Amino acid sequence: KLPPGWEKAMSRSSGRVYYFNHITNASQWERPSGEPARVRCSHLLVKHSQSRRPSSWRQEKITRTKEEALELINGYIQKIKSGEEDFESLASQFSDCSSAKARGDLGAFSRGQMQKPFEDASFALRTGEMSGPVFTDSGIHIILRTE
Ligand SMILES: Cc1nccn1-c1ccccc1N
Numbered sequence: 159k160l161p162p163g164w165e166k167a168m169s170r171s172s173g174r175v176y177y178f179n180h181i182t183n184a185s186q187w188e189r190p191s192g193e194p195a196r197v198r199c200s201h202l203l204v205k206h207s208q209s210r211r212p213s214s215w216r217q218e219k220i221t222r223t224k225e226e227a228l229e230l231i232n233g234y235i236q237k238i239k240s241g242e243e244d245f246e247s248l249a250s251q252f253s254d255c256s257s258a259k260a261r262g263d264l265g266a267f268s269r270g271q272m273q274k275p276f277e278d279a280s281f282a283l284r285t286g287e288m289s290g291p292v293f294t295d296s297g298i299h300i301i302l303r304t305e
Contacts, residue, residue: 161192163282181282182301183290191284198305199280200245200262204230205254205297214254224298231291231298238288238300245288245302254297266305276301 163181205220206227212220237243249262273294283303292299
C-alpha cells in the first residue's frame, strides 16, 4: 500500500478517499509522499485537568476537560490549515508550554528524550509537516516538524 503509518480512509461526508496516519494523527486528501538521528519540532500544547502538571504560564490552575482541550486543539488545527492563522502565532498565544515564548520551538532532539507519543509523531512527520492531535501525559499537542 502506502508508506508505513498511513492508511486509506473514506470521508463520511463526501465519500472521497483520504489518507490518515495513525502515528501523527495527520489526515490529508493527497496520497502521502513515500529515519534521521534528530528532528527539530515546534508544538502547541493544550493542557487539561488531567495533565501531569495542570498549570501553565497562561493559567495557574488548568481546569478544562480533556474533551475541551481536544476541541481547542481541533480549532487551532482548522485555523492553521485554512491559513487564517499561523502555527507560530497560535503557539505563542495559546500553547500551555514554556516554549510558547519561542513560537513553540523545542529545538532538536533524539529518540529517547521526549514523551513517546510525541517522539513517534515527531519522527514520523516529514519536514515541514504538521501532526494531528497527539496525546501525552502533558496534554494534547499540535506538532510541527521544522527540521
Ligand atoms: C481522544 C478523545 N476524544 C475525546 C477525548 N479524548 C481524549 C483526550 C485526552 C486523552 C484521552 C482521550 N481519549
